Design a binder for this molecule. Structure first.
Ligand SMILES: [Cl-]
Ligand SMILES: [Cl-]
Ligand SMILES: [Mn+2]
Ligand SMILES: [Mn+2]
Ligand SMILES: [Mn+2]
Ligand SMILES: [Mn+2]
Lengths: 369, 361, 361, 369
């Protein structure tokens, strides 16, 4: 039994509202959908996804396709579908980095596995430890006006956990904006703030404590990804914990941080770690070193969101919470059944493989020209 | 509910060996679908190494660990491990026995080798490193030329029972006729003092020793670090890596060159693997170590070692080969000094019911 | 406005070599005054080294980087680099290609070598260090006595494709007839494990190896530090120094003896220089390294290496010499095994339009 | 093409008010004006300047001239004007230290370059990143009476950033004085305090927090230059950042501080670093290590002020601000066009070279007898 075909198709997905990060605003969602067909007719799907282009991690849907088609494909076509380990090491041997590219393949491979065996990947991992996850709602960098009307409404549906996306505008304007919205958020809530590593060490130390005073509960990647020391000084001064996101993309980084004592938590995410196995390993290192985990978002459609949801359900710790709200914000998808939410909670897919299936009409419909 | 565990048993089993018995505790888990999974608790030879024994293991399992296993969904191995940790501190070998049994049950329900749940094999055979007893000079110049000509190119002299000085003179004597080209591990079992390790270990390195397995006490991180640096050979932790937090501490402290991976001390498949993952992330090497064990633990282990990225220190799963009989229908096959990785569903071995009854204590 | 960039193009170009093609992406920037600057994106041979390829580079440039280049004042190279960082994480080789092209355009508008903007040359020629392929023993005893008699007194054996053990036996064989007086770098490409580096690297040092370029993985600072100290030879980072923050970390951690300076991995002229400045401030040595590249990147590089305070590890800009043809009117001149630093405006080379069309993919 | 002459002339410049530092009060300004004439008739100018004598850095206008005339000249006369790199290394090879001396030559050399090429030095550097810089107004150590009338007026013209010069009198009197003036300064402002490294570790820890409570925003060199540890302990205790000035004069010091984690920022200044290249390198190290920069003053006339202004405009970071107010305080100069201010901002010279030209009548007029 061998892998027979693998296609990588760029898909654009209509999105319910624009999503402004530090270096772009996202007007729709863009993924590469990977497909792996095997010798006796079984199929797996993976997704490559990015927070609106190469600003975050240097990968783009356009270049992802190419790396997959041209440089990765050769170690996947004709291979034994069950040898995901060797396929991952093969890919590393031909291409440095390009983790979002590797993630979509490694992940499609696991989906294939789950479906050949007729079980959810979460089994292959040792089984779910929870069936539902509470979702952390992430506000866009929009105005404080819009967000007070959005907060009040999401508190409604049931969320008690929030994230403010930051870094699109100077520290000082940005923090006033956020302090504004925090006025109409109950004291009891979790609030992460995520400047996407765009703040200076000076700005971080100026504004974080002011925001912690106003109820901000966690600081996600406040300063640059390589500034381990600065992160460590912050972790000491601050009354609130610091989470690595951009700073943890590999198991080696996990270790370096853990023991430089540079952060309080990991944001765990498949694409950025180059797949399901590596993502768990990073979380295993959090466990081994007593750091918390967050079920983080890229964001992604229901394809990657589903395998992620299963991951996060196998994980021993998501004390920081989970932000898998992304799919909820898409108006359409390439799956037959997108992720189901309820009263502000994700229900973990249980179907075989990743737990979601292609809809080939939608795929065709939303393929990019 | 879906399928549940209706039954678990733990049976002490004394198997005949060439050294005069290896005691194990065989765990047996049953589905509400009549499916069964098996796992093995083993100890080097009782509580001297960790603080565990077949007699005490049986109890821990029967009385303290079973209440979180009976009733549950088998697919929930993680919650089972977590629930065990919560009721029982330590007792890794007991834990590993249940945990592996569960992985066995899954492999056999899904119809695949457990190596597939670990993302497949990266290799099909593994060269075996042969370990001599703490025996007497002559016998080892015999036993080497035997196991040597039959294929094995990698070796370990078990040390610790003699006084370090004469104990060296013995190991040094055996060595004088082992090809300088071979790989040699020494394993004092952490019984050497820091001073004996510094005086005797360079001398053996010169005589061709390749790797010092746990020369000094398990808690002595600084000493281990002092040695990793003062020697021309790598240091390998064994007694010192039993948990994922220890693996991390050692990496950090630059204490050792390599980790010995074994499933029993680690408390199960997932944990031993996690430990190996740490070795990879810090660029330390792995050894596919042995408790030792029969083929129950041996099989699942060989599958684990098979899926592992790194196994460059070698692999010493020779243990089953020393047994005169077994409680599986089909013991681990070896070939010109290589182990042949079990390929069938679960761990890839199954009970011989007659023999299980014959060797039960 | 004053002068603006009206146009930028990126063309994939496959040039014939003696190993069967070096792919580059040639960048071309145009003034609103009809002035042009050129720059080269290069990869060792695709995404294996960094994660970059000519196909993906072209895209990054055409679609993601150009929106901050078209329109702007050419003199504003700094704001251009900063604006690129902001839109694209990583992708240094793409970035370097635009950045150098911009420096080219400036040099050629001002009528001076870019070396003048860097505060002038400190030297006119540079001895070239010759790098052998990961080839087979015999060929390298041939190719040495050739490149040796033609002048070269400094060498690098590319390693990593073979298993460390035989790979050494090969490099050790070639060495036995290279004058003990020569300089020898080894570059496993970070493919060696910590253990293989510790066992094999002393042996080559004895056989006359002079410098270990990136023996172990790029992230393994501690291992690099452990080696810098346990060896009798210097360690040189390459894969490990791609940014100014990495250079600083390594200095700090006492991890390496020297840095390999290359413009592509560094993301441009200013950054590679900044990295070299760090080497000076910490008293680590520089090597004038190679991607390798054709004469586009080669020229500007040779000018950079020319302005640098320290180049004592040597310089390995032999790359263009291996090309059968080129896309400049006038390739880098060599002489009795020394490179002759380009002297004309900008990078000191210019397009051959016929050839650019002939070798375009 | 070769350097033909180089003269070094001591100039005294009438100054609008006296400037009291820790170890003198400055009654006028004193510079050595360096001139480099080349074979085909091109000229560059540099300035050597000092904060009122050798108290700060051990250099004086009188000894600067001598080092230039006697020991530096020999590697500059007859040299290729474009080989600034080798000229700098040559100078280091003959004279240890004497950075203000080296700066005036290295800098004159760059001015020459810019003018031969007919462009602003800022081009040679990679181009301006801003055309204007807001200026930080530095009060003298005068009485708190005078300063309340000066603060109120400078706030007027447009400044929102201030520095209090300190160290002329005991810590306790000094800080009360400063607290006085801070009463009539708006909360929103930046305030640096600069004791010129004259405070003890005890005094620093006593008074800094009291001053931070009253609105002081940065502490410049509070303790001795060599007390890296003490600086590091301060950086930890304090709610406000610490800036190295006297402690950063070389690229090696930059590195040592950065990674002893001893300060929050660098004060960048050409004279003290021995020139334009070295000054950028120090700033490059700030970038590489995530420390902020300040466009610092010596102060200097418009000659050095102009090349500095260009430097600071090329720099990626001046988050601490810029204090190039010095020239504004001179009543006359040796240039034809001094630095232009507007509504409390410096406009960066754009003309070729350093961007300012000699006025040979003024030079003659203000040469010292
Ligand atoms: Cl994010
Ligand atoms: Cl000052
Ligand atoms: Mn984030
Ligand atoms: Mn042992
Ligand atoms: Mn290299
Ligand atoms: Mn100062």
């Amino acid at each position: 039994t061998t892998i027979t075909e693998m296609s990588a198709t760029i898909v654009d997905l209509p999105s319910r509202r624009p999503h402004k990060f530090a270096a772009t605003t996202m007007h729709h969602q863009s993924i590469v959908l990977v497909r792996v067909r095997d010798s006796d007719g079984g199929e797996g799907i993976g997704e490559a996804v990015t927070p609106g282009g190469p600003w975050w991690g240097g990968e783009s849907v356009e270049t992802i396709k190419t790396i997959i088609d041209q440089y990765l494909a050769p170690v996947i076509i004709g291979r034994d579908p069950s040898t995901i380990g060797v396929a991952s090491q093969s890919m590393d041997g031909l291409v440095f980095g390009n983790s979002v590219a590797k993630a979509a393949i490694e992940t499609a491979l696991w989906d294939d596995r789950e479906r050949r065996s007729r079980i959810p990947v979460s089994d292959l991992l040792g089984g779910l430890r929870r069936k539902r996850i509470p979702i952390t709602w992430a506000f866009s960098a929009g105005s404080a006006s819009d967000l007070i009307d959005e907060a009040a409404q999401k508190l409604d549906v049931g969320h008690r956990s929030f994230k403010f996306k930051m870094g699109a505008e100077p520290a000082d304007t940005d923090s006033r904006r956020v302090l504004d919205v925090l006025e109409c958020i109950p004291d009891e809530c979790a609030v992460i703030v995520d400047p996407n590593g765009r703040w200076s060490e000076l700005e971080a130390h100026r504004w974080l404590p002011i925001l912690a005073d106003a109820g901000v509960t966690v600081a996600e990647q406040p300063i640059a990804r390589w500034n381990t020391d600065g992160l460590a000084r912050l972790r000491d001064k601050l009354s609130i914990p610091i989470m690595a996101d951009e700073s943890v993309t590999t198991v080696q980084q996990a270790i370096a941080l853990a023991d430089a004592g540079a952060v309080s938590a990991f944001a765990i995410k498949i694409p950025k770690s180059g797949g399901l196995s590596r993502a768990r390993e990073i979380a295993a290192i959090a466990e081994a070193s007593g750091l918390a985990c967050f079920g983080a978002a890229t964001p992604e459609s229901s394809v990657m969101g589903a395998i992620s949801a299963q991951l996060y359900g196998t994980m021993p710790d998501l004390s920081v919470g989970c932000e898998l709200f992304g799919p909820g914000l898409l108006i359409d998808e390439v799956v037959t059944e997108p992720l189901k939410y309820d009263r502000g909670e994700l229900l973990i897919p249980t179907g075989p493989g990743s737990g979601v299936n292609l809809d080939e009409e939608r795929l065709r419909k939303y393929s990019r020209d």
